[PDB]
Amino acid sequence: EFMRVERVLLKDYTTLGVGGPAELWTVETREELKRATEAPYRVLGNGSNLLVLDEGVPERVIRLAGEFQTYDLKGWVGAGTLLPLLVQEAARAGLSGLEGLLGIPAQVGGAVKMNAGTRFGEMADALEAVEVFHDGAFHVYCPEELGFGYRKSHLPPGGIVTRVRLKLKERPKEEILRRMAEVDRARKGQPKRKSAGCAFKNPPGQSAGRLIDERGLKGLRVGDAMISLEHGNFIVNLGQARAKDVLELVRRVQEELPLELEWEVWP
Ligand SMILES: Cc1cc2nc3c(=O)[nH]c(=O)nc-3n(C[C@H](O)[C@H](O)[C@H](O)COP(=O)(O)OP(=O)(O)OC[C@H]3O[C@@H](n4cnc5c(N)ncnc54)[C@H](O)[C@@H]3O)c2cc1C
Numbered sequence: 406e407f408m409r410v411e412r413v414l415l416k417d418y419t420t421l422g423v424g425g426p427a428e429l430w431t432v433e434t435r436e437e438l439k440r441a442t443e444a445p446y447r448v449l450g451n452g453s454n455l456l457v458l459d460e461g462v463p464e465r466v467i468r469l470a471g472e473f474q475t476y477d478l479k480g481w482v483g484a485g486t487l488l489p490l491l492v493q494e495a496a497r498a499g500l501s502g503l504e505g506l507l508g509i510p511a512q513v514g515g516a517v518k519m520n521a522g523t524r525f526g527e528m529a530d531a532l533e534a535v536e537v538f539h540d541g542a543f544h545v546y547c548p549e550e551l552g553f554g555y556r557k558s559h560l561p562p563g564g565i566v567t568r569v570r571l572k573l574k575e576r577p578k579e580e581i582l583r584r585m586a587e588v589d590r591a592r593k594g595q596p597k598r599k600s601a602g603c604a605f606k607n608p609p610g611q612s613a614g615r616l617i618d619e620r621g622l623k624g625l626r627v628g629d630a631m632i633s634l635e636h637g638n639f640i641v642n643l644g645q646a647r648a649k650d651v652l653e654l655v656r657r658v659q660e661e662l663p664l665e666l667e668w669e670v671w672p
């Protein structure tokens with residue numbers, strides 16, 4: 406009954422660095438989660454796939470912390486745990502199964518919601534069980550029950566991923582690290598770092614980054630929003646970008662290429 410609730414700007418809680426006002430509820434316990442979800446809500450993970458508009462959102466924005474950030478690689482892993490932590494912890498433990506998720510700056514819950522992945526593997530591959538809170542109760546699902554597709558899930562309506570069990574296998578630490586090194590090599594062309602990740606989806610048999618590059622769109626700038634000079638499928642925030650500027654740049658790309666956004670827009 407004593408969870409932290411505060412007014413924030415979502416620009417401070419997204420990797421893109423844009424976003425207006427929201428009421429943030431930081432939940433540490435199952436009872437606090439039950440209370441936070443009594444009115445309309447959204448769940449915020451690491452904010453790495455969100456384009457939040459300058460007006461912000463009116464709903465309660467829930468962050469999972471406390472018990473939801475504790476983990477055991479061989480047991481339950483809280484959904485508020487950072488996926489980059491688990492990738493490194495698995496290597497340390499000689500546990501294979503997360504290597505293909507290197508470089509994805511997600512919380513576990515966000516990685517499940519967006520079935521985050523690379524050419525090497527996806528979040529769904531690494532799951533044994535998923536606890537989802539919906540309709541006022543906690544339920545346990547196998548991943549085959551969650552409607553996974555390419556960078557997609559079909560969670561129960563209003564579902565909050567709270568905890569998972571991972572599917573991992575014993576391998577030599579050095580081998581795990583070699584696999585991770587290939588993932589790192591494959592990601593070398595992405596910006597030395599800053600964004601909400603890939604802005605656009607790839608059309609069937611096409612590449613968004615390559616298409617944007619060939620169209621000469623790298624370097625186009627609206628205010629402080631710019632198509633990265635390093636990778637065509639990244640829009641970067643050069644300092645004080647507004648979401649309006651990012652959307653304008655998106656529209657400019659879409660005037661040239663029939664691309665759909667990979668980012669989710671709030672509200
Ligand atoms: C530098 C960079 C590189 C990236 N590379 C990749 C990549 O290689 N592959 C890839 O797939 N994606 C990539 N992304 C996109 C992004 O990291 C993924 O979509 C990631 O899964 C989002 O997780 P998040 O915790 O940041 O979620 P957020 O952006 O916070 O939220 C995304 C969605 O998940 C929901 N959500 C968050 N937590 C929960 C929860 N506990 N329960 C239910 N719903 C929840 C939110 O409501 C929202 O709908 C990249 C992003 C960046 C910035």
Ligand SMILES: [Ca+2]
Nearest residue numbers: 544545546547
């Ligand atoms: Ca079940």
